Amino acid sequence: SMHKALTIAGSDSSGGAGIQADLKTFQEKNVYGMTALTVIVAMDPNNSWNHQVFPIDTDTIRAQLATITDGIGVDAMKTGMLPTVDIIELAAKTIKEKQLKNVVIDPVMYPEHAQALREQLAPLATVITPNLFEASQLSGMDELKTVDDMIEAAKKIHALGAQYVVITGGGKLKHEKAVDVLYDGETAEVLESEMIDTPYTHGAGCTFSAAVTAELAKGAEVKEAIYAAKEFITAAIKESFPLNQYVGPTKHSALRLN
Amino acid sequence: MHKALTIAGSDSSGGAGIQADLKTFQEKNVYGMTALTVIVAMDPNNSWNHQVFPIDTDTIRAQLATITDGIGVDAMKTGMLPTVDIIELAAKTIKEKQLKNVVIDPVMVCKGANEVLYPEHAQALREQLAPLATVITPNLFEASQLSGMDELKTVDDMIEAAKKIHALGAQYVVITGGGKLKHEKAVDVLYDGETAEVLESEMIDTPYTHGAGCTFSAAVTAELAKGAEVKEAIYAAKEFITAAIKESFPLNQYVGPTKHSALRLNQQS
Numbered sequence: 263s264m265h266k267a268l269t270i271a272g273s274d275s276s277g278g279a280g281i282q283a284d285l286k287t288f289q290e291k292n293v294y295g296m297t298a299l300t301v302i303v304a305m306d307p308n309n310s311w312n313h314q315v316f317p318i319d320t321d322t323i324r325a326q327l328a329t330i331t332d333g334i335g336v337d338a339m340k341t342g343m344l345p346t347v348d349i350i351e352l353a354a355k356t357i358k359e360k361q362l363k364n365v366v367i368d369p370v371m372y373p374e375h376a377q378a379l380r381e382q383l384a385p386l387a388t389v390i391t392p393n394l395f396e397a398s399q400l401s402g403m404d405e406l407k408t409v410d411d412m413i414e415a416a417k418k419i420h421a422l423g424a425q426y427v428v429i430t431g432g433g434k435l436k437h438e439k440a441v442d443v444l445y446d447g448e449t450a451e452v453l454e455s456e457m458i459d460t461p462y463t464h465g466a467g468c469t470f471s472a473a474v475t476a477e478l479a480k481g482a483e484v485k486e487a488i489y490a491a492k493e494f495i496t497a498a499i500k501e502s503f504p505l506n507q508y509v510g511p512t513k514h515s516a517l518r519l520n
Numbered sequence: 521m522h523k524a525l526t527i528a529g530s531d532s533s534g535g536a537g538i539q540a541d542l543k544t545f546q547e548k549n550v551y552g553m554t555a556l557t558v559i560v561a562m563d564p565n566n567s568w569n570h571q572v573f574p575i576d577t578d579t580i581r582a583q584l585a586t587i588t589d590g591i592g593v594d595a596m597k598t599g600m601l602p603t604v605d606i607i608e609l610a611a612k613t614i615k616e617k618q619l620k621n622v623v624i625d626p627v628m629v630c631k632g633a634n635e636v637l638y639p640e641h642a643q644a645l646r647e648q649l650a651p652l653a654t655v656i657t658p659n660l661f662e663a664s665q666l667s668g669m670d671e672l673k674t675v676d677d678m679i680e681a682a683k684k685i686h687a688l689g690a691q692y693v694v695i696t697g698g699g700k701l702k703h704e705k706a707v708d709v710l711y712d713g714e715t716a717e718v719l720e721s722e723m724i725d726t727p728y729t730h731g732a733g734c735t736f737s738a739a740v741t742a743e744l745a746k747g748a749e750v751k752e753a754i755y756a757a758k759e760f761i762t763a764a765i766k767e768s769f770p771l772n773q774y775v776g777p778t779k780h781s782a783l784r785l786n787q788q789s
């Protein structure tokens with residue numbers, strides 16, 4: 263009695279982003295989650311939280327994918343941190359060959375890395391969910407500063423072959439509200455939620471894309487799912503908190519408890 | 521949020537290890553963090569054969585550093601620690617960082633008949649990790665390995681194993697029996713220093729109990745992290761997998777996990 267989702271992403275030792283975010287989000291929305299781990303990330307506690315990154319062998323990634331895609335099926339799927347061009351290639355190759363449905367590509371950002379994302383993974387996306395930095399990279403334009411900027415980036419990145427584009431803006435956008443831009447082939451919609459005044463938004467992007475994936479896995483319409491996911495991080499950011507002086511994750515259980 | 525650490529392995533099929541642990545932690549509103557020790561896959565064209573990919577001791581150390589030094593935890597469990605070095609690292613971490621509410625799930629590696637083919641692994645579990653446990657949660661196989669006795673067949677066997685393994689230094693022992701015990705009910709044995717209690721639940725007639733033991737120990741851990749008494753937590757955890765097994769289901773022809781969301785949705789919470 264469960265719908266299933268795959269996340270091809272990284273481990274976040276601190277527990278608010280990557281695999282952890284993804285599994286936490288999946289679980290909150292009653293979707294049976296499975297992970298293909300691509301890197302292990304740690305933050306050094308005596309070195310001002312310095313990211314230490316431990317990449318996982320391509321073969322190991324293949325093995326996990328084998329069992330998840332060939333041996334079980336998935337109703338939806340997302341990519342998070344794919345740290346290497348080979349891994350982007352493996353992910354893209356898996357998606358085509360296994361003909362995976364409801365592909366939510368979160369283009370977590372080397373030149374050829376950005377380019378592989380653009381040239382191999384983007385065209386395969388049902389939904390693609392860049393933030394302002396990621397959006398301007400994929401579209402090849404300058405720093406996005408206005409809601410108009412986001413809109414022409416959305417069109418530009420949609421032109422790569424992604425079905426739907428969500429450009430995430432929120433806290434990093436100068437604006438009265440927390441705004442994202444949703445674009446089908448046709449028209450741009452501006453999604454709005456309350457701005458939460460908080461620096462505690464670690465793993466928000468991973469949680470948003472996770473929340474889209476989960477919703478897509480349960481059979482929702484793409485736009486329906488994106489709205490639902492917008493509802494989810496808003497609640498999860500509103501109840502966000504600090505872990506230590508470097509990092510404050512979102513509260514995935516927030517929608518459920520309120 | 522209350523916080524819990526799991527020092528355990530990744531299950532690609534999503535019902536056991538890290539996945540079970542996180543899923544359980546989340547259901548019970550405990551902020552989960554993982555120190556990954558192995559990646560395990562199952563070969564789809566080779567009858568679901570376990571492919572195991574161990575993680576470098578240094579990488580494990582680094583994850584532990586950030587979890588234990590950089591954030592704290594309210595409780596903690598160990599799952600699959602595939603290597604003596606990894607048992608030693610886990611034990612060393614527990615001591616040095618003075619971790620509280622230590623739930624040790626003594627997952628054994630090289631199973632065979634009723635013996636472990638990696639003797640010193642089992643021994644390190646016995647001599648180094650067991651004494652550190654607030655709760656230790658062996659199943660029938662694991663229990664007889666720790667206690668040095670023969671295959672457990674009866675509730676009496678479980679009781680003397682519990683006494684034997686409590687003698688290692690674990691504060692509380694739960695011997696898990698459930699589906700693998702010939703019995704009318706799904707029974708586990710809880711033992712403090714003093715008296716043995718027989719925990720009972722409905723037996724669910726189902727082969728879909730993959731990751732049950734991981735889920736049980738995660739549930740204890742989560743409940744401990746929220747401030748519960750040890751026995752209180754064990755009862756709550758007993759309630760949790762009962763529900764999760766009752767609503768269990770198949771993924772394919774080889775494996776059926778428990779439904780972690782069951783208690784939330786499938787019995788009055």
Ligand SMILES: Nc1ncnc2c1ncn2[C@@H]1O[C@H](COP(=O)(O)OP(=O)(O)O)[C@@H](O)[C@H]1O
Binds near residue numbers: 393
């Ligand atoms: N302060 C905030 N208040 C409310 N919502 C926010 C806030 N910051 C970000 N969001 C929302 O959370 C989601 C995460 O997007 P974003 O932060 O751009 O990605 P990332 O977290 O990877 O940087 C977006 O839907 C965004 O609108």
Ligand SMILES: Nc1ncnc2c1ncn2[C@@H]1O[C@H](COP(=O)(O)OP(=O)(O)O)[C@@H](O)[C@H]1O
Binds near residue numbers: 726
């Ligand atoms: N068929 C079943 N019906 C009800 N409870 C069960 C069943 N099988 C196992 N359990 C319970 O699930 C929990 C997991 O224990 P066990 O299956 O022994 O661990 P493991 O998964 O490590 O083998 C225990 O509390 C046990 O009593």
